[PDB]
Structure formats: structure tokens, C-alpha cells
Design a protein around this ligand. Sequence first.
Ligand SMILES: CC(C)N1CCC(c2cc(-c3ccc(F)cc3Cl)c3c(c2)N(c2c(Cl)cccc2Cl)C(=O)NC3)CC1
Length: 349
Amino acid sequence: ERPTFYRQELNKTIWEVPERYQNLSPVGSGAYGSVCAAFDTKTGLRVAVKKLSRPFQSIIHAKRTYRELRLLKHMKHENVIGLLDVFTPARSLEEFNDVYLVTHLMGADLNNIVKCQKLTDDHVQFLIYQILRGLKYIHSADIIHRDLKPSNLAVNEDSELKILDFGLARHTDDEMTGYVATRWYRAPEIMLNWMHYNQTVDIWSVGCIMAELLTGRTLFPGTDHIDQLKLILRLVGTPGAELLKKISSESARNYIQSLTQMPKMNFANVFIGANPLAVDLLEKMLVLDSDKRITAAQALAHAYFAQYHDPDDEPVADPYDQSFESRDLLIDEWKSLTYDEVISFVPPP
Ligand SMILES: CC(C)N1CCC(c2cc(-c3ccc(F)cc3Cl)c3c(c2)N(c2c(Cl)cccc2Cl)C(=O)NC3)CC1
């Protein structure tokens, strides 16, 4: 049941894809690979296809390819980017060297659409509800996104939202330096490596996104790591004794204690004119001590989402086995595991 493949060149890249996929049009290329939009004649869906760039060129890249395929194959939720299809034109492991990943075409991200704009409260409710719905699912599988920001939120013309580009990290030091959106949505404990982080980092990011949707302004647009920390602590207060103890980094703990203590600000005086329920939720997400932040499951039940919340339609995921992360395998071993995952793929019903 191997489909028939056909070939075409799009901006200097050869795409070899099953006949079902028609009207391929490039959207972009980079180190990540190449993306096109297409129409899936079999399902009637508008799709986006990612062709991975050299996916087995080093041990690190082979493992990265396996990691992404595993994550995308696991995710089956309305608010999370998952796989409609995955294919290779290769007929054997020996000739296997290209991976194509098919998902829904959303066509924009939240950053490209609403940057610098203040959204209506009902609009923010719908957008944040969807993010939290997807996060409840992701977190239930013990997956951490780690890099949630407006540009990682795929959105269509009806403001329907799917979370993408996650569980994958892994930014360079340069990319996180200076006046950059790559760092503005990061929880302080991960930005400054205070301690072993967990899924609560994502809730901080949601707080930062929500604030920005409500105001049209970046919440913590730091010019560098330290400037950003100062912006954060001005809003949420300096750490107390309880949190200082949890900062397992001696150097980081020492630095924090050099700062003049500041109390948490009144969020009602920061977010002037906002829905008091939005203000309440922001206070519960933007807690310095990650242990004390609201979870996605808890936030869904918050009164702010009364119009959207349905406890019978906020599903959880199967557990996700990431034991492979602890393994040092050879290129050909990662490649074989990836091939097994490609060939074992079963499409959605
Ligand atoms: C961080 C940079 C390097 N990265 C930004 C995201 C890009 C990107 C990747 C993927 C993707 C993800 C997983 C998968 F299995 C297959 C695919 Cl194609 C999609 C999109 C964008 N978009 C999209 C958006 Cl969000 C805005 C405009 C146009 C388009 Cl096509 C979709 O609509 N659907 C899927 C890839 C490059």
C-alpha cells in the first residue's frame, strides 16, 4: 500500500510526495528544513508539510530527528500540532534519508497577527483557553513545551489555535542574548538556571502571553537577562526565604540576595481596566515560586473561562515515554529507530 510518489522542485529543493498531495507552494526554508502548503485530496484538508534538512548528518541531529518524530506522533489534540501523515519516498532502511511531516495548515502565528495590538477580553478568553486546553494535554503526558511564545502559537482566520515547535529546545546562548523575544516569555528559574525546572515553566509563559494580549505590550521586554530579571522582580516581588532555599544554584542565590527587597505590585494598578477575573488569573500564573503557580488543569476551571470551560471536553494524553533521552546511540541506531517510527505510522481515523 505504498502510494505513488511524484517529484517537483520548489525554491531549489526537490519534494517527492504521494500523489494525494497537490498544489504545493513554498512557505519558507532554513536550518529546520523546508515548509510548503498543500492540499490533501484524500482528506480535503489544507496541509503544511515539513521536509527535514539532513536529518541523520550527526549523532545530535539523528537524535533530534527521532525526538521530533516521537513527539509529533504522540500528540493527538485539537490545540496541539500533531501528525496527519509522515512519509519517506525510500523503499528500504538503506536508502532512507528524507523525512516528510504533514500537519494542518493554520497559515499564521499569533505574533505575526496581533503584535502591538490590544485584544478584546472575549478574544483573550478564547485564545488563552485554547492554549491552556492544549497545555493540560501536553503536561498530562509529562511533556514540557519549554519555549512557549506568540510565534509558537499557530492560528487560523477564526482564531483557532494549535501549539507548535515544542519539547525540542535547544537555543544557543547567542539567540537568548539581548533585546529578544526568544527570552521574554521564559520563567526566571529557567532563564537563570536557578534549579531543576518542570512543566510549571510553561504557565509563566502563558501569563506573559495573556498580559501582552490584554495590553498590546510585551510584559517583560528585557534588554538582557539581568534587566529582564529586574523587570520581573519589580512586578512579582523579590524572592522570600522559602523560594531562596529552592534556588539550588549557589551563584544565582548569592546574586538574588544582593538586590534590594521589593514587594509584589498591585496587578489591578498595572492592568488598569482589565477584567478583574483576568487580573486574578494573571496573579495566579505569574508567581515567582513555580511550586505555587496555578496548573493548566486548575486554570481551565477558573471563572475567567466560564463561557468556554467544559470538563467533559478537556482531554488528557497517554503517557509519553522519553526514556530514549537518557541513551547514547550511534547514528545508524537513531536512524533505524526513526525509520521504524515512519513505517509504523497509522493515520487518524
Ligand atoms: C521556528 C521556525 C524555524 N519555524 C516556524 C514554524 C514553521 C512551521 C512549521 C509547521 C509544521 C510543524 C510541524 C509539522 F509536523 C509540520 C509543519 Cl509544516 C507549521 C507551520 C509553520 N505553520 C505555519 C505557520 Cl504557524 C505560520 C505561517 C505558515 C505556516 Cl505553514 C502551519 O500552519 N502549520 C504547520 C517552521 C519554521
